[PDB]
Amino acid sequence: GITKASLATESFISAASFQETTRVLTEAAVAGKRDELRGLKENVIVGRLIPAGTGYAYHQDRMRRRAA
Amino acid sequence: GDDEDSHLGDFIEDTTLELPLDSATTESLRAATHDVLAGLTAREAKVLRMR
Amino acid sequence: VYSYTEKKRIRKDFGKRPQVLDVPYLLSIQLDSFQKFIEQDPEGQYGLEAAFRSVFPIQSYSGNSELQYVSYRLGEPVFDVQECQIRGVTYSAPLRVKLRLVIYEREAPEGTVKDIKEQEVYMGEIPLMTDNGTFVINGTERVIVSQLHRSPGVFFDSDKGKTHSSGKVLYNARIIPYRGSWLDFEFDPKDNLFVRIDRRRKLPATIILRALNYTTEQILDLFFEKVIFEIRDNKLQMELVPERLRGETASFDIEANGKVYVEKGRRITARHIRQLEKDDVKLIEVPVEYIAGKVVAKDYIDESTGELICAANMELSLDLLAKLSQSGHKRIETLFTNDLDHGPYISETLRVDPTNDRLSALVEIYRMMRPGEPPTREAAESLFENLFFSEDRYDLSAVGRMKFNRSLLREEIEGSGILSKDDIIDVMKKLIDIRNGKGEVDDIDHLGNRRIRSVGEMAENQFRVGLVRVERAVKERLSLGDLDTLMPQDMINAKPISAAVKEFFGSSQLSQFMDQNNPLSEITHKRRISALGPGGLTRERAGFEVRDVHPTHYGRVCPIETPEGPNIGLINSLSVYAQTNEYGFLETPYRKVTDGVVTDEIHYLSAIEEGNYVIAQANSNLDEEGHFVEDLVTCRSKGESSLFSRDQVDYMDVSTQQVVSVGASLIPFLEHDDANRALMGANMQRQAVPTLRADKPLVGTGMERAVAVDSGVTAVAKRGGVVQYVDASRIVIKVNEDEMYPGEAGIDIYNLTKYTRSNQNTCINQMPCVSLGEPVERGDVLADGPSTDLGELALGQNMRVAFMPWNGYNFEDSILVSERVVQEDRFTTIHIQELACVSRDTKLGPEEITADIPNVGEAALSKLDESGIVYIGAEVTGGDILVGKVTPKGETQLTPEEKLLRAIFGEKASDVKDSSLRVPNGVSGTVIDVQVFTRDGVEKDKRALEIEEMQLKQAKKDLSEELQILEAGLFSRIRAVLVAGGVEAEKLDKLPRDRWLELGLTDEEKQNQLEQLAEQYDELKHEFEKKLEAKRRKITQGDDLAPGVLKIVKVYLAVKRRIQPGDKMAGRHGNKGVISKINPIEDMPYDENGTPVDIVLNPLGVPSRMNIGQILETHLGMAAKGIGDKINAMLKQQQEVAKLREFIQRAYDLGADVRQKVDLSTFSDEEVMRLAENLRKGMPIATPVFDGAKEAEIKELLKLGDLPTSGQIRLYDGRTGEQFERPVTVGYMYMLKLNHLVDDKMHARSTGSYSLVTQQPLGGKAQFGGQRFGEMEVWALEAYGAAYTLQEMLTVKSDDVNGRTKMYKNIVDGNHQMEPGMPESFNVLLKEIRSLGINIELED
Amino acid sequence: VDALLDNGRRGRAITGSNKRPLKSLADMIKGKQGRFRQNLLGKRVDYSGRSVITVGPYLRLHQCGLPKKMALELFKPFIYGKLELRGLATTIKAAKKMVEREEAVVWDILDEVIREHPVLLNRAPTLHRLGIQAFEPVLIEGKAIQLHPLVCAAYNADFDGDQMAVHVPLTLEAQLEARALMMSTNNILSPANGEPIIVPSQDVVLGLYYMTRDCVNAKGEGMVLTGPKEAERLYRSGLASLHARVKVRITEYEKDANGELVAKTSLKDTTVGRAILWMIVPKGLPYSIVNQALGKKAISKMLNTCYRILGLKPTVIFADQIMYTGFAYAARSGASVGIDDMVIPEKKHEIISEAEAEVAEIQEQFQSGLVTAGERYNKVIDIWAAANDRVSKAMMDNLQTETVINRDGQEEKQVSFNSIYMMADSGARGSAAQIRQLAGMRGLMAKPDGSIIETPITANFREGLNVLQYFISTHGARKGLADTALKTANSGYLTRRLVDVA
Ligand SMILES: [Mg+2]
């Protein structure tokens, strides 16, 4: 479904800012999860440039500069 | 209010802050007094920066 | 014969059907309820007496003491209404109750007391209702709103085919008390009866019956019918009743007495049963297979062994019947059972039931109510006998018992307030019958299932809660140890009771601030039926079933007045004629219809009785005697409305307005509007701001006068007389001798209210409408309130509207207002603010209110007098200082270069921070009052002394004027008395006027009246002195302020808002709209005579919204102003009185078969010129709600004027000068001015004050806050490619604490660039996640 | 501890002095009032204000009116910077006092900083992407934000007290995104379907429908004109009616070449209204795009055709010109609405009497038991629905063509100039089901349970309903209101689930 596929995401902040926070946070804590900030809600919450519009060039540069 | 989301914690200001206007005036005063002290002799400028 | 307030200006009535019942007192509900509360009832059924008798007497815990109740008396208030609103305290009256303490003797249950003592104990204060129906709670006028809740009783409700896969309908019965535990029986998909208490885990239903001390045999006797089985040494005979046999299959030959009735393959029909009835069939032979399913009833114990052959409720088989056959048992009682008529529900419940005795059932009950603690023999019995069987913890009480007995079809109407065994058994039997098919379920929304609580009942409950508190306290104190020779002034604490009553009146959901910006707004706020509140449904747990108009709202609750929004249909408004029952239910009047004659006796039919009759319609023409015109008259029997014969009809509606409320019956031509637009018009009529000079409705409904008078705004006369002196602030009436009391020489004095603010900051101001030397009558209007014109509710002004599209300046819903409308000062209105400046006690010292303020010039301190406070009358604008105040400030510690500036230029640092009160940014108006309150130990400044001296002088003057007017009237009456019987023309004024009160007269009522008048004079002379002394003591005394505040200064500004683009203006028919331009006079479309229109509306708003009422109101206003212009032309040159009378009576005669004949033959040649001078601005017209002024009458009236009968004239353009094609519709539409002013809506913020935990801006316009850039706007910026605008919206502008100062300095510095950083709310979130046992970190 | 980490999970919540449960840490994070949705995804924002909105038709669709007071309060740092840059102030304190006194030299600075600086006008339920658009301010004397008429469809705004919040973009990239991405002239097509979103709405389509019509005998019928300029000079001089069938010589340009415009000239059988309107259409469009009655769909199609052929700049200029001329001729038409414009059919009472006789016949045949109660109910419903359809047909056929005027002869039919019919046919705020409740009958209403009442209400709003009919027709209105008041809560949650899955 829409809700069940939005709650099952690799990123856990884009799922914890969705409906249920206690369950998502407990599972992501026991699993030792790691959020790599690839979507739009993660970069909105953190307060940086969205990877979609005018920030796409910036995010491409930050990606290619990494490990190179 | 007669609802949620109107909690008393949303109405309390932060009185431990300075206005951005205060910061701008402090920076402007700092620059202006530096330029005024520049227009004096080096010895008197140092005596006024030490006093 | 017309009332003298109705001969000034007679409103032309267009209604055809006569009215037989007068509109009731509109505020009778609030006043009657609070009269039932504070009253002395000898029977003690309702009020304070019914709470005192409900709690007291209190008996100690075998301590041989008893505190008992005797009487009470409501004390007198210390401050009246105006003083309570000025000072800021509740208008309440002390409740002092007389109690009596008695101590008992040991080994004396009801023995003689040895020591008694009685006294009067003060138990809190109860707030009092004002003259109108509003409470004054803390200076503020509040209104307690009635509630519509579910009446106590028993309600059977189905599950209407939900919550199951197959679709079986489940039935459940609920017993709702007035106070206590909810008990609920419900079915199961397996037809097992289940019970549950307080909505907890369910139990099998027979558990409570076993708890009622029943065995299984007794239950089977209660719920079933016995079938007897017999044996004549063989063949197992069965006694048969003909009725039971139906619905079975006679696969065998059913025969009796050697006669065959049924054959093989023939099932039982009705004819076979009638054959059996005719042949008197009793006993039959039946095989073992026929009895192979029957159930034994009781236990059949064996003759010899005594062992249990078979216990209660176990099905008989071949072997068990064979076993009990030879044991000596020739009688077997079994249970009759079917599949559709009698059911096996109790039997299955018993087979599921685990409990076996009373104690086992009690333990099974105690294990759900108190899970976890071990059960006990005593504890379970205490719990169950205390659940539903103790008057302390269970009440129904009276309406509950009446509903309970009515629902079970019992005869008696009043009974005990607690349950009983037969009551629960009757509920179970009724539910089983509902399951079988006999009865039918109820509906909750039915207005015979919902009560109406009011102020009296809610206040009584809240008082009884406090009484229970004080009962616990007294019983704890009374029963301890001793006696102890103490009077009952210490066992009672007054605070737990007053705290409860103040918790109700002050902070409750139903104790609302009274909207006070209209007479209509007040009178429709007091008549409100809220469904929410304590004991009522939540706004979210309200379905779509309780938000629909039900067929039993006809006459009881308005259908088209409910607040659109999140609660539509939970805030209904009471109808016009509806009133509360004796029990609480709503009822509406109806005219009794005899065999053929519609009588005039008014019977109030409730919501349950009205369904049994056949009620006619109010649009049912009678032939001037009572008989209906046609035999087929539309009626409504029970919900559904159809056609019924004239002999069949039994009741008729009383009036044609009784369906609608008091706010939706002021809309002319309601019957043409849509229902949505009528709802919006009704809801927007109560927001109209009272303008500078309220005019009149040129098209009314006849309900304006009742609303204006029955509210509290206008000052109506109490006793008829002749006006002796009218001032702008008082009116003195000289009562006629017919209405005067024998004792006093009464001349009534009416004090008017001048410019006091309301709750909504508008202005309340009463002007006299009578003139010196003019008769008045009882109930006649003397002074007009806000939005009132000679006792008629005038909410707005009527202006020359036009319907055309005008260059797009009225595009969607906008309006285009001419400049004559703003020049003529007709939509301007006076708003009165109130600013307060409290001087407190800080730790570094007090705060002064001096007029010497640092860092402020003299151009700012020009308007402050020597004491600091501003003058009265000083026109202040935005930013001007009102009350100069300073605050002590220390620990300066200036940074470097600030010390340098100060050292170079001198001017040592200021040691007091200027925190004065200044006018808010934007408002600008005169100062009309300044009040100063001081604590009871602080020295008063010069200005407070000036105010005190002025108030003392004014109070002395007012008491002197009272005494002087009353004394003048008394001496004049004594002189008049001393003329009849002892005529002395000039012998009377010679002697001093003080010795007139001792002379004599002949033998009549006047000689034992001079003594009465002397007593009145002495009483007035003492009254003047006592009032002066008390008033001086009240003025001079200190005030009781908050702990820590030294003095308060309150400044009242008067702002006058004119009109501007943005101000919302609506009409009565739900056509709102925001003004969009203020055209010059020349640009407006002028008609053929040069008169421009004043407002240009839009035509496209009519066909898609279907409020066709406004077009007809426009035409009727055109006709009324045409009549007015004709009268004004005949008056402009002094014509005659003959022609004026002829034309006026010709205007009052149209049209077809109206009531209200106004023949001007008796008017006395000065009441015609006054009438024709009040009609020169347009003849007012009344168009009742559903009675209407039909189009033929409108066209006839338009023909009576010069105006064309179409309603549309040829209109020229103002700017081009060239004529508009397609003639346009002009008329006079009544425009309101709603209270959504543009200068209360607009605000802007560049940098203000930031919140505390999350460093973000605050809420709007009072903390100078920013606009919420919520989630959906974030998505709307992600949908574009705007990733930089979004980043500066959520980092630099809002939350990130260093980048916002850096960005401000960059913007001032000429460089538009942000160094963003990270928000602060994210750091708050990291701390709040990390402060669990969860480690979350930002790693790279 | 378990009441501190998450209060109320085990047992019952502990309560403070308020006798309310107090918030733990999990309640600080969870829910609509938690840090995740109230403070991180949505924020309160500086440099922003709101006010009521009005019309202001004189604007071009890339500018909005902004009050001087709002524009002085939002643009304060820019004003301080400019005052100290140009030398009118000693420092920023003196500049602050200068803008506080509202000196006469600060309005020139305000007009300087306002010039090319967009603002973001936003309406509160921002349902779709076109709910935030950026306009260029025009300083206005007042307190109402003036909003161009053509964007009211996009905002879903109407002027009955609705208010919009404006935001200021600070940095250079924010201004360039509000100019190159979010500007009002760059959003004229919907993002859900390719159809335009700035189509003219209600006054202008009525003016353009009134302009482009034809009546069978008007002033100046049959003249031959030398161009649209002569047609306009004929109309403004009072010598020809706005709709009179004439012959005009129009020169239309077609782009049949590989990017070139070819001028061709002919003689067309048109009116004066269409010839006047042809002065506004740009080059590349044909002439059969205005030679019609020009309802609302036709205007939307004309704008779409111009956008597909010519581009963006002529489409924006065309939209502004259409709005201006539509407002002008809607004003000059004087199209009003009176009580004689709601024509009852001449044969309504005959149809109602026939239906009542037939339903009485059905009742009398029911009382003999020949039909079941349900079959009788269904037959009654079908009879009344057929009667309602016949009344509606009679009304519409009496409304659309009852006008008849002669040309040098006896009589001739044409479409009607009835005001309500023009407002319904042109698409300007009306339909054929909103009418027939004004002139015809308004049919059968339903009860709360779902059943439609057997007897319908045979009265309309021209002649009013009685007490019982008006009370019957109130449940439908309350169900409509109680569905619009709680369908938004379902839609706003569906769209949030959709946004957070994608
Ligand atoms: Mg709106």
Q: Please provide the DSSP assignment of C1006-1035 as one string.
A: TTTTHHHHHHHHHHHHHHHHHHHHHHHHHH
Q: Are A22 and D181 within 8 A, CB to CB?
A: no
Q: What is the distance between the alpha carbons of residues C668 and C672, in angstroms, rounded to a whole number?
A: 9
Q: What is the distance between the alpha carbons of residues C252 and C1166, in angstroms, rounded to a whole number?
A: 104
Q: Are C1242 and D70 within 8 A, CB to CB?
A: yes
CA distance B48 to chain D (A): 23
**Residues C1059, C821: contact at Cβ < 8 Å?**
yes
**End-to-end alpha carbon distance in chain C:** 96
Whether D141 has its CB under 8 Å from any CB of chain C: the answer is no
The per-residue b/e assignment along C834-865, b for 16 or more CB within 10 angstroms, e otherwise, is ebebbbeeeeeeebbbbbebeeeeeeebebbe
Q: What is the distance between the alpha carbons of residues D350 and D361, in angstroms, rounded to a whole number?
A: 17
Vertex C786 angle, CA C785 and C789, to 5°: 70
**Residues C379, C367: contact at Cβ < 8 Å?**
no
Residue written as token pair 């300007």: D428
Interhelix angle C455-478/C28-37, rounded to 10 degrees, is 20
Taking residue C197's Cβ as centre, other Cβ atoms within 10 Å add up to 19
The per-residue b/e assignment along C173-188, b for 16 or more CB within 10 angstroms, e otherwise, is bbbbbbebbebbbbbb
Gyration radius from chain D CA atoms: 31
Restricting to D residues 343-382, those with a Cβ less than 8 Å away from any Cβ of C are: none
Beta strands D63-67 and D132-140: pairing type? parallel
**Residues C706, C1182: contact at Cβ < 8 Å?**
no
Residue C88 half-sphere exposure, CB side, CA atoms within 13 Å? 9
Alpha carbon of C1015 to those of C189, C740, C969, C971, C1008: distances in Å? Answer: 85, 17, 15, 13, 11
Alpha carbon of D136 to those of C143, D168, D502: distances in Å? Answer: 49, 11, 33
CA C1201, distance to chain mean position in Å, is 45
CA distance D416 to chain C (A): 13
Q: What is the distance between the alpha carbons of residues C659 and D468, in angstroms, rounded to a whole number?
A: 9
Q: What is the distance between the alpha carbons of residues C98 and D88, in angstroms, rounded to a whole number?
A: 81
Distance C502 CA to ligand 1 centre (A): 40
3-state secondary structure of D242: coil
CA distance B24 to chain C (A): 6
Whether D423 has its CB under 8 Å from any CB of chain C: the answer is yes
Gaps in chain C (C to N over 2.5 angstroms) fall after none
| Cis before C1151 (ω within 30) | yes
Restricting to C residues 1255-1294, those with a Cβ less than 8 Å away from any Cβ of A are: 1274, 1278, 1280-1284, 1286-1287, 1290-1291
Q: Are C1220 and D423 within 8 A, CB to CB?
A: no
Q: Are C901 and B29 within 8 A, CB to CB?
A: yes
Closest CA to D328 of C434, C1152, C806: C806
| Cis before C484 (ω within 30) | yes
Alpha carbon of C1248 to those of C110, C432, C1264, C1293, D74: distances in Å? Answer: 75, 69, 6, 11, 11
Q: What is the distance between the alpha carbons of residues C1213 and C804, in angstroms, rounded to a whole number?
A: 11
CA C1063, distance to chain mean position in Å, is 29
**Residues C582, C452: contact at Cβ < 8 Å?**
no
Residue in A with minimal Cα distance to C1337? A34
Q: Which residues surround ligand 1, an ion (CB under 5 A)?
A: D 158, 160, 162
Single-letter code of the amino acid located at C760: Q
The per-residue b/e assignment along C1153-1179, b for 16 or more CB within 10 angstroms, e otherwise, is ebeeebebeebeeeebeebbebbbbbb
List of long-range contacts for C557-560, beta carbons under 8 Å, 24+ apart: C557/C447, C557/C529, C557/C586, C558/C659, C558/C660, C558/C661, C558/C663, C558/C664, C559/C659, C559/C660, C559/C675, C559/D471, C559/D474, C559/D478, C560/C660, C560/C664, C560/C675, C560/C678, C560/C679, C560/C682, C560/D474, C560/D477
Given A29, A47, A54, which is nearest C1283 (Cβ)?
A54
CA D132, distance to chain mean position in Å, is 17
Whether D73 has its CB under 8 Å from any CB of chain C: the answer is yes
Supply C1110's token pair: 């406004």
Restricting to C residues 1113-1152, those with a Cβ less than 8 Å away from any Cβ of A are: none
Q: Are D91 and B32 within 8 A, CB to CB?
A: yes
Residue in D with minimal Cα distance to C1304? D77
Pick the residue of A12, A24, A50 with the most C CBs within 10 A to test the interface with C by mutation.
Answer: A50
Given D142, D157, D323, which is nearest C1062 (Cβ)?
D142
Alpha carbon of C7 to those of B30, B37, C808, C1173, C1264: distances in Å? Answer: 81, 89, 46, 12, 55
Q: Which residues pair with C723 in a beta bridge?
A: C733
Taking residue C933's Cβ as centre, other Cβ atoms within 10 Å add up to 20
Q: What is the distance between the alpha carbons of residues D495 and D131, in angstroms, rounded to a whole number?
A: 15
As a three-state string, the secondary structure of C1176-1200 is CCCCCEECCCCCCCCHHHHHHHHHH
Supply A11's token pair: 């990123």
Supply C209's token pair: 């019956």
Q: What is the distance between the alpha carbons of residues D416 and D395, in angstroms, rounded to a whole number?
A: 13
Distance D158 CA to ligand 1 centre (A): 5
Q: What is the distance between the alpha carbons of residues B48 and C329, in angstroms, rounded to a whole number?
A: 128
As a three-state string, the secondary structure of C1260-1312 is CCCCCCCEEECHHHHHHHHHCCCCHHHHHHHHHCCCCCCHHHHHHHHHHCCCC
The B-side interface with C (CB below 8 A) comprises 2, 9-14, 17, 19-21, 23-24, 26-27, 29-30, 33, 48
Distance C1293 CA to ligand 1 centre (A): 29
Distance C822 CA to ligand 1 centre (A): 25
Beta strands C1181-1182 and C12-13: pairing type? parallel
Q: Please provide the DSSP assignment of D65-123 as one string.
A: EEEHHHHHHHTHHHHHHHHHHTTS-SSHHHHHHHHHTT-TTHHHHHHHHHTT--EEEEE
**Alpha helices by DSSP H, D224-347:** 228-236, 272-277, 297-309, 313-333
Strands (E), C474-551: 511-513, 529-530
Q: What is the distance between the alpha carbons of residues D10 and D25, in angstroms, rounded to a whole number?
A: 15
Q: What is the distance between the alpha carbons of residues C965 and C956, in angstroms, rounded to a whole number?
A: 14
Residue written as token pair 């009849």: C980
Vertex C213 angle, CA C209 and C218, to 5°: 70
Q: What is the distance between the alpha carbons of residues C1167 and C1141, in angstroms, rounded to a whole number?
A: 10
Contacts of C796 by beta carbon, 8 Å cutoff, 6+ apart? C688, C691, C694, C695, C1230, C1231, C1232, C1233
**Residues A41, A13: contact at Cβ < 8 Å?**
yes
- Sign of the four-CA dihedral C103, C104, C110, C116: negative
In chain B, which residues have their Cβ closer than 8 Å to the Cβ of D92? 21, 24-25, 28
Given D33, D38, D96, which is nearest B21 (Cβ)?
D96
Q: What is the distance between the alpha carbons of residues C1083 and C1212, in angstroms, rounded to a whole number?
A: 10
Whether C901 has its CB under 8 Å from any CB of chain B: the answer is yes
Q: Which residues pair with C573 in a beta bridge?
A: C528
**Residues D188, D315: contact at Cβ < 8 Å?**
yes
Q: What is the distance between the alpha carbons of residues D161 and C323, in angstroms, rounded to a whole number?
A: 90
Residue written as token pair 């003591």: C1033
Q: Are D477 and C560 within 8 A, CB to CB?
A: yes
Decide: B and A in contact? Rule: 3+ Cβ pairs under 8 Å: no
Taking residue C1218's Cβ as centre, other Cβ atoms within 10 Å add up to 11
Whether A18 has its CB under 8 Å from any CB of chain D: the answer is yes
Contacts of A56 by beta carbon, 8 Å cutoff, 6+ apart? C1281, C1283
Closest CA to D195 of D302, D62, D310: D302
Supply C518's token pair: 């209209």
**Residues D336, C804: contact at Cβ < 8 Å?**
yes
**Residues C698, C795: contact at Cβ < 8 Å?**
no
Q: Are D52 and C1300 within 8 A, CB to CB?
A: no
Residue written as token pair 């919006």: C680
Single-letter code of the amino acid located at C584: G
Distance C1074 CA to ligand 1 centre (A): 10
Taking residue C808's Cβ as centre, other Cβ atoms within 10 Å add up to 25
Sheet strand arrangement including C135-136 = C135-136, C141-144, C511-513
Q: Are C1286 and A45 within 8 A, CB to CB?
A: no
Single-letter code of the amino acid located at C492: I
Sheet strand arrangement including C730-735 = C749-751, C730-735, C721-726, C775-776
Q: What is the distance between the alpha carbons of residues C951 and C665, in angstroms, rounded to a whole number?
A: 45
Closest CA to C1304 of B21, B31, D91: B21
Q: Assign domain C829-947+1047-1057 one CATH number from 3.90.1010.10, 2.40.50.150, 3.40.50.1980, 1.10.10.10.
A: 2.40.50.150
Contacts of C85 by beta carbon, 8 Å cutoff, 6+ apart? C136, C139, C141
Given A14, A21, A54, which is nearest D30 (Cβ)?
A21
Q: What is the distance between the alpha carbons of residues A55 and C1317, in angstroms, rounded to a whole number?
A: 16
Q: Please provide the DSSP assignment of C1220-1274 as one string.
A: PSS-EEEEEEEE--BS--HHHH-EEESS--BBSSS--B-STTTS-PPEEE-HHHH
Q: Please provide the DSSP assignment of C808-857 as one string.
A: TTTSSS-EEEEHHHHHTT-S-EEEE--EEEEEEB-SS-B-B--S--TT--
Closest CA to C147 of C568, C461, C450: C450
Which technique was used to obtain these atomic coordinates? Answer: cryo-EM
**Residues C36, C46: contact at Cβ < 8 Å?**
yes
In chain D, which residues have their Cβ closer than 8 Å to the Cβ of C569? 478, 482
Residue in A with minimal Cα distance to D5? A22
- Residue B2: burial class (beta carbons within 10 Å; 0-12, 13-18, 19+): exposed
Beta strands C1075-1079 and C815-818: pairing type? parallel
Q: What is the distance between the alpha carbons of residues C1078 and C1099, in angstroms, rounded to a whole number?
A: 20
Single-letter code of the amino acid located at C1110: Q
Q: Are A21 and D36 within 8 A, CB to CB?
A: yes
3-state secondary structure of C726: strand
Decide: C and A in contact? Rule: 3+ Cβ pairs under 8 Å: yes
Residue written as token pair 């003999």: D368
Supply C1319's token pair: 């928000």
Residue written as token pair 């990494």: A66
Q: CA torsion D50→D56→D61→D64, rounded to 10°?
A: -30
Supply C174's token pair: 């609920």
Strands (E), C569-720: 579-580, 586-593, 598-606, 632-634, 643-645, 651-652, 699-700, 715-716
Q: What is the distance between the alpha carbons of residues D233 and D162, in angstroms, rounded to a whole number?
A: 41
Distance C759 CA to ligand 1 centre (A): 27
3-state secondary structure of C1129: helix
Q: Are B25 and D91 within 8 A, CB to CB?
A: yes
In chain B, which residues have their Cβ closer than 8 Å to the Cβ of C563? none
- Residue D248: burial class (beta carbons within 10 Å; 0-12, 13-18, 19+): buried
Vertex C599 angle, CA C595 and C603, to 5°: 105
Closest CA to C712 of C515, C574, C511, C520: C520
Q: Please provide the DSSP assignment of D164-224 as one string.
A: EEEE---SHHHHHHHHHTSBGGG--B-SSSSSBS----SHHHHHHHHHS---SS-TTTT-E
Residue written as token pair 């809660």: C465
**Residues D138, D63: contact at Cβ < 8 Å?**
yes
Residue written as token pair 């549950």: C196
- Residue C372: burial class (beta carbons within 10 Å; 0-12, 13-18, 19+): exposed
Give C798's DSSP letter.
E
| Cis before C57 (ω within 30) | yes
**Residues C696, C1181: contact at Cβ < 8 Å?**
no
Pick the residue of B11, B27, B28 with the most D CBs within 10 A to test the interface with D by mutation.
Answer: B28
Vertex C754 angle, CA C752 and C755, to 5°: 150
Closest CA to C769 of C844, C846, C713: C713
Q: Which residues pair with C869 in a beta bridge?
A: C883
Contacts of C1113 by beta carbon, 8 Å cutoff, 6+ apart? C668, C669, C699, C1067, C1068, C1069, C1227, C1229, C1230
CA distance C1254 to chain B (A): 9
Q: What is the distance between the alpha carbons of residues D167 and C414, in angstroms, rounded to a whole number?
A: 68
Pick the residue of D170, D239, D362 with the most C CBs within 10 A to test the interface with C by mutation.
Answer: D170
Give C686's DSSP letter.
G
Q: What is the distance between the alpha carbons of residues C123 and C492, in angstroms, rounded to a whole number?
A: 8
Among left, alpha and beta (phi > 0; psi -120 to 50; other), residue C1217 is left
Q: What is the distance between the alpha carbons of residues D286 and D333, in angstroms, rounded to a whole number?
A: 27
Distance D485 CA to ligand 1 centre (A): 14
Single-letter code of the amino acid located at A64: R
Q: Which residues pair with C1074 in a beta bridge?
A: C1064
Q: Please provide the DSSP assignment of C866-930 as one string.
A: TTSBBPSS--B-TT-EEE--EEE-----PPTTHHHHHHHH--PPPSEEE--EE--TT--BEEEEE
| Cis before A17 (ω within 30) | no
Closest CA to A24 of D308, C362, C1329: C1329
Q: What was the resolution (in A) of this experimentally determined structure?
A: 3.5
